[PDB]
């Protein structure tokens, strides 16, 4: 029952276990339904050698995590998990 | 005189659980999940609960918590679906996952 | 969006001022007489009248005292004000079903 990951606020589909905790952050190789905003930043990056960009939910605008450059680092408590 | 000590069924007032019995499963008492019908639930985990009626036999299908089987938990007074009872697992063997917005919190 | 008193329309609070106390802006609560309320927390509000001295008895929010909040314009009981805490020192718990949300 924890195969698909979704925006907690509106339910937009974001990623899946096939693409997949370290706040607790989940790293995914691929994601959908986000909007990546702004230019990359290195400041306080949790992953050595990566810059990040803010990742919002494309449906409701909730801040779900970051895109790193590649992979996506998403905040566990901003997501809902459920079955495929 | 604490005003946030007891959880009762929002629909009828049945005594269900207590703040003192919240349980941080995987490091957090709160879990946000969805079922196969796409319903999103803000689930609070409790070590203990009362005043429920646990319906049928456990199932592992679609379980949100690795290693646990679930049974539907209704309010034993009014039949409101308040969450699930989990069993069959490890550390703990059992717990309750209750739907936060279906409870009312208040004084003892 | 703004929240207006459902009974008379006076502006009371704003969506920008929603406050997630204990991790959620919504709290379903019951008082000692067993009345159930669905309360939304806001940092600020306007147009209310707070009645009585603050009380700590049965506060729904640990570390805060409460005062009853009426609409100042029509008298509707819209919720409570909370004070005497830290981070934040004060906020409101307003009864969702007694407000109307709409454009400013
Ligand atoms: N005989 C009564 C009737 C009502 C109340 C009442 O509504 N109290 C609220 C105040 C707000 C709060 O944070 N907690 C409460 O429980 C009461 F205390 C005593
Ligand atoms: O790799 C990252 C992503 C960004 C993240 N981060 C935050 O969580 C945060 C909160 C407030 C202001 C600025 C930041 C920031 O850089 C952080 O600490 N590291
Ligand atoms: O851990 C659990 C509890 C039960 C829950 N569940 C539901 O809420 C549901 C609704 C309809 C068909 C099947 C299911 C199911 O397994 C679910 O998805 N996971
Ligand atoms: Zn969203
Ligand atoms: Zn009930
Ligand atoms: Zn009014």
Automatic annotation (TrEMBL), chain A:
Which InterPro entries does this one have? Answer: CULT (IPR034750)
Query: Is Endoplasmic reticulum one of the keywords?
Result: no
Q: What does the entry list as the binding residues for Ca(2+)?
A: 21
Would you say which domain of life the source belongs to? Bacteria
Q: Where is the CULT domain?
A: 2-83
* Keyword terms of this UniProt record: Calcium, Metal-binding, Zinc
Gene Ontology molecular-function annotations: metal ion binding
The positions annotated for binding Zn(2+) are 7, 10, 57, 60
Q: Does the keyword Calcium apply?
A: yes
PROSITE patterns in the cross-refs: CULT
Gene3D superfamilies in the record: Peptide methionine sulfoxide reductase
Protein name, entry field: Cereblon isoform 4
User: Which species does this protein come from?
Assistant: Magnetospirillum gryphiswaldense
